[PDB]
């Protein structure tokens, strides 16, 4: 396993996409998120 540089950490004046859902979730000890009703 090895690493290779891929870019700067910069904000780019970028495509805009994606929803913004509000979800009820629980997180268990294995780090797994799950939906809650």
């Amino acid at each position: 396993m090895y690493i290779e540089r891929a870019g700067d950490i910069t904000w780019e004046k970028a495509e805009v996409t994606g929803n913004s859902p509000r979800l009820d979730v629980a997180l268990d000890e294995s780090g797994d998120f799950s939906l809650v009703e």
Binding site: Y2, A6, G7, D8, S20
Partner: protein, 145 residues
């Protein structure tokens, strides 16, 4: 050792992404499962890890501490395998948990993008991408140490 975003590779296959900042490499635990990493001729050794946060840091303690402000758009700096780094701007949704709200981005990129940083308007890393839920649209928590 240089600050920036990095591909996490294996022998080549891209298994994840991480952030180098202040000499510490940050990625998600499920990307490396805490294994040592090669950086040129040097070795990065795991320093702190937490399976429940799904985070790991190498050569030092976790350095990233910005957080989402709850209103502004953010940018996912996705590093997909075989593609150049690209910025995807979005407004986070919210994971509502028993222990408070977590920002979340409803963006679905290849699994080798796990560990890509999410940035605020000031260019600071507010979390890493790649641990989340399927609503099948994937929604990733903005995971911050």
């Amino acid at each position: 050792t240089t600050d920036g975003v990095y591909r996490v590779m294996t022998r080549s296959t891209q298994v994840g992404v991480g952030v180098m900042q202040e000499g510490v490499f940050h990625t998600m635990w499920h990307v490396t499962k805490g294994a040592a990493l090669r950086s040129g001729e040097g070795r990065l050794d795991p320093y702190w890890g937490d399976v429940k946060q799904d985070l790991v840091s190498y050569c030092g303690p976790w350095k990233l501490d910005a957080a989402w402000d709850g209103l502004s758009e953010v940018q996912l700096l996705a590093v997909p395998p075989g593609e150049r780094a690209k910025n995807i701007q979005t407004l986070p949704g919210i994971f509502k948990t028993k222990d408070g709200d977590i920002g979340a981005v409803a963006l679905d990129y290849p699994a080798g993008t796990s560990g890509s940083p999410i940035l605020d308007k000031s260019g600071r890393v507010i979390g890493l991408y790649g641990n989340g839920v399927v609503i099948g649209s994937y929604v990733s928590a903005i995971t911050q140490g």
